Amino acid sequence: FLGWLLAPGRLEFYEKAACVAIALRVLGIVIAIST
Amino acid sequence: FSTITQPDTDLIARQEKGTLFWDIWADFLVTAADYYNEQNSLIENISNDFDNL
Amino acid sequence: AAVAAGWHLASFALNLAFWGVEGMPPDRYWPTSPRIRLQIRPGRYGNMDGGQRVYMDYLARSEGVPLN
Amino acid sequence: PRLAAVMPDAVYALVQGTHKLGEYAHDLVFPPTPEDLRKLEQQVNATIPREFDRVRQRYAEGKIANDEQLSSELEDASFNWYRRQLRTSVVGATDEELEDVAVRKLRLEPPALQASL
Amino acid sequence: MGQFYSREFDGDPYVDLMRSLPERELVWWAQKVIWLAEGFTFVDHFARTYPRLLQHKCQRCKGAGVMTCPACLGGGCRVCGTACAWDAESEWMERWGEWESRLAYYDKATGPLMDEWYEDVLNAGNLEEDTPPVEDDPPGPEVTGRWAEHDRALHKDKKRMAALMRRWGHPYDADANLGYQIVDPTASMGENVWNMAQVYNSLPPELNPLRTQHLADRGGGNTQAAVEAARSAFDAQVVMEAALLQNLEAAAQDLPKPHRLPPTAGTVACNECGGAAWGYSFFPNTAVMFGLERPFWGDTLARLSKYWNPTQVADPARTGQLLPYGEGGLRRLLALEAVVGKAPATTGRYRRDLELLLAHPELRDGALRVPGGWGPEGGLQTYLRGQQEEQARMQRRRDLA
Amino acid sequence: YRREMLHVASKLNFRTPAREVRIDTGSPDFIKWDDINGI
Ligand SMILES: [Zn+2]
Ligand SMILES: [Zn+2]
Numbered sequence: 001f002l003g004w005l006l007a008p009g010r011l012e013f014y015e016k017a018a019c020v021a022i023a024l025r026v027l028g029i030v031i032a033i034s035t
Numbered sequence: 036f037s038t039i040t041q042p043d044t045d046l047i048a049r050q051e052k053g054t055l056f057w058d059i060w061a062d063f064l065v066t067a068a069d070y071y072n073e074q075n076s077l078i079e080n081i082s083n084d085f086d087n088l
Numbered sequence: 089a090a091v092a093a094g095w096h097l098a099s100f101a102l103n104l105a106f107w108g109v110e111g112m113p114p115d116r117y118w119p120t121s122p123r124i125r126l127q128i129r130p131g132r133y134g135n136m137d138g139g140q141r142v143y144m145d146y147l148a149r150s151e152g153v154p155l156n
Numbered sequence: 157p158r159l160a161a162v163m164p165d166a167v168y169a170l171v172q173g174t175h176k177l178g179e180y181a182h183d184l185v186f187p188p189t190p191e192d193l194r195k196l197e198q199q200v201n202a203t204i205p206r207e208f209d210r211v212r213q214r215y216a217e218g219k220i221a222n223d224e225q226l227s228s229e230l231e232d233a234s235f236n237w238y239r240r241q242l243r244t245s246v247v248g249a250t251d252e253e254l255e256d257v258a259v260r261k262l263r264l265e266p267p268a269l270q271a272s273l
Numbered sequence: 274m275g276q277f278y279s280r281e282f283d284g285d286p287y288v289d290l291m292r293s294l295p296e297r298e299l300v301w302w303a304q305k306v307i308w309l310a311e312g313f314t315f316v317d318h319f320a321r322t323y324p325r326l327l328q329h330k331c332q333r334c335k336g337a338g339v340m341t342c343p344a345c346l347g348g349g350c351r352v353c354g355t356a357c358a359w360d361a362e363s364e365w366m367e368r369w370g371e372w373e374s375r376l377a378y379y380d381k382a383t384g385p386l387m388d389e390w391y392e393d394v395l396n397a398g399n400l401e402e403d404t405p406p407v408e409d410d411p412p413g414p415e416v417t418g419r420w421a422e423h424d425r426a427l428h429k430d431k432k433r434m435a436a437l438m439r440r441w442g443h444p445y446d447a448d449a450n451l452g453y454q455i456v457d458p459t460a461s462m463g464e465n466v467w468n469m470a471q472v473y474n475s476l477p478p479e480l481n482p483l484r485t486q487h488l489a490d491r492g493g494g495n496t497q498a499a500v501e502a503a504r505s506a507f508d509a510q511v512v513m514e515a516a517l518l519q520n521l522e523a524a525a526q527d528l529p530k531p532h533r534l535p536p537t538a539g540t541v542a543c544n545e546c547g548g549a550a551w552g553y554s555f556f557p558n559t560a561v562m563f564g565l566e567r568p569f570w571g572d573t574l575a576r577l578s579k580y581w582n583p584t585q586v587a588d589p590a591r592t593g594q595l596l597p598y599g600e601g602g603l604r605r606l607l608a609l610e611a612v613v614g615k616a617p618a619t620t621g622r623y624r625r626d627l628e629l630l631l632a633h634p635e636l637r638d639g640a641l642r643v644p645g646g647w648g649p650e651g652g653l654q655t656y657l658r659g660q661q662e663e664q665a666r667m668q669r670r671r672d673l674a
Numbered sequence: 675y676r677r678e679m680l681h682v683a684s685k686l687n688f689r690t691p692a693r694e695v696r697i698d699t700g701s702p703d704f705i706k707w708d709d710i711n712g713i
Contacts (some may be wrong), residue, residue: 044308049133107568293681
């Protein structure tokens with residue numbers, strides 16, 4: 001099960017999604033505190 | 036039939052966010068407005084109730 | 089194999105003999121629309137004013153109207 | 157950010173943190189001996205290669221460094237030991253011919269049992 | 274992303290708040306893609322793991338699809354299978370030679386060294402050199418010995434390599450190895466399959482049809498035929514390897530194997546199933562659902578220990594049975610193998626070479642490395658015949674002058 | 675946060691006119707039930 005869940009393709013998807021989520025959260029912070 | 040026609044994640048999240056923004060935040064600032072009573076008035080009341088709350 | 093298929097054929101002929109509803113009265117525990125029976129209706133979100141348009145064409149494609 | 161590198165770091169953090177927490181909580185209920193802290197120092201002292209002794213004493217008498225002159229000093233002894241190890245592995249040690257390497261890597265000679273008793 | 278303006282989006286209390294906050298719309302789009310990814314994953318897991326309850330196995334062969342032919346346990350058996358290809362033990366090293374040749378083509382392990390040497394032999398004009406090493410020179414001749422031979426052959430290093438470069442080019446130019454920068458271990462899978470699918474890059478030179486597409490006609494009518502008739506066998510071998518590895522990956526767990534292969538030289542097919550070892554049944558196979566498909570070691574131990582110990586209740590006194598069961602017991606009742614074991618009879622085919630390795634000790638020198646094989650067509654005997662023949666050639670050339 | 679408050683306060687008219695009422699029962703002029711008559 002874990003060999004299927006942490007396959008390389010799924011790993012790269014998780015990486016991309018985490019990066020974009022961090023970006024959007026920090027952008028929310030930036031546009032909120034500068035208001 | 037009655038299982039697969041329930042609201043999916045989008046609608047459930049919309050409901051939760053709507054209750055957070057309108058079931059508490061709306062009536063609270065309504066109370067503030069009546070205590071303090073067109074964008075200028077917006078800025079006025081948000082600033083005042085921000086300060087003294 | 090002939091017997092085992094004749095069973096199904098008899099069932100299908102019986103279902104054919106019905107042909108519809110003529111002979112069946114209305115029933116109040118089983119209306120014809122499942123939304124009445126299941127108490128389903130819309131809420132406040134998910135309702136756009138641009139939705140009725142697409143609604144109509146769905147209707148137009150269900151009733152057979154070929155115009156679309 | 158490259159989870160394929162984060163997972164080993166996560167397990168490493170867990171292992172090392174558990175070990176440190178354990179040693180902490182172990183030297184509290186049992187305070188360490190005030191003198192055999194020198195004995196464990198001697199035990200780790202008996203294991204250092206010889207290529208480092210030319211540096212070691214130099215650190216006692218001031219001479220050695222400020223902080224980085226040392227860090228570049230250990231690299232020289234380290235690579236000397238490293239190249240000595242390469243030589244010993246391939247062409248043999250300091251006092252053994254090729255036949256002794258052959259009998260070493262063919263495991264033809266048992267560990268001496270008669271002598272140890 | 275400024276899509277929720279228009280008039281098609283009035284009537285929802287939340288879309289308007291996203292009309293005034295584009296950060297909210299960005300969050301909305303991100304979440305609306307992530308939720309769909311998660312749904313795909315859920316459904317994929319279900320479809321992967323649910324069919325495992327409906328798999329049932331034959332109860333006679335226990336999902337092997339194949340039973341033994343007992344006669345072949347102790348002009349052969351006509352009932353049991355046919356031999357395989359790697360069973361001929363006399364052709365093992367030849368097949369391995371062909372395979373390692375074909376494998377040396379793709380092998381990109383030494384890639385960086387070949388790359389730097391190719392770049393040095395292409396430019397040959399930069400010369401970013403430094404101080405040459407203090408050179409010791411080889412011994413003069415007339416000093417016979419081994420160390421002298423080592424040093425002498427070692428120092429003639431540049432003219433020999435030059436002759437090598439003059440005969441065979443750099444490997445990338447003769448197409449002997451894969452191309453210059455076709456594959457990169459850190460780029461992506463898609464780019465690498467694109468680069469390799471470009472011009473028969475997946476095929477070695479020997480099977481590349483472009484090498485031969487120009488001349489083939491009345492002379493032999495074979496070269497372009499005996500090449501497409503070898504590339505076919507090659508691809509069959511590759512697909513067979515894929516099938517075997519899928520079987521092994523299924524057998525790594527306790528799952529039943531997907532590819533049912535025909536019987537082999539010691540086994541016959543099961544006669545309850547046709548050899549189809551298992552199947553799907555719409556009935557849930559409770560043994561998997563409750564986890565009882567493995568049999569508790571003690572039970573198997575008991576069953577086997579009672580199977581290998583047949584019991585005799587009768588006594589040969591009452592029943593006049595003098596011999597154990599079997600046929601022709603009377604003839605059955607009528608050297609130093611006990612001191613030095615039996616002689617192994619599967620290795621006679623090497624005897625000859627062994628004897629050579631005892632008559633010519635010099636062949637054990639650490640400098641030599643022959644191809645490998647057993648017949649007079651392989652390895653040791655090839656080198657030996659070459660040595661004797663060339664020394665005879667030179668002997669005859671000495672006297673004529 | 676605040677940025678949103680402004681958007682809500684801009685729409686505070688389209689929402690609902692129902693004002694909850696905090697009635698008193700110990701108030702001095704709070705009217706009991708039958709203190710009103712003629713009814
Ligand atoms: Zn079977
Ligand atoms: Zn047989």
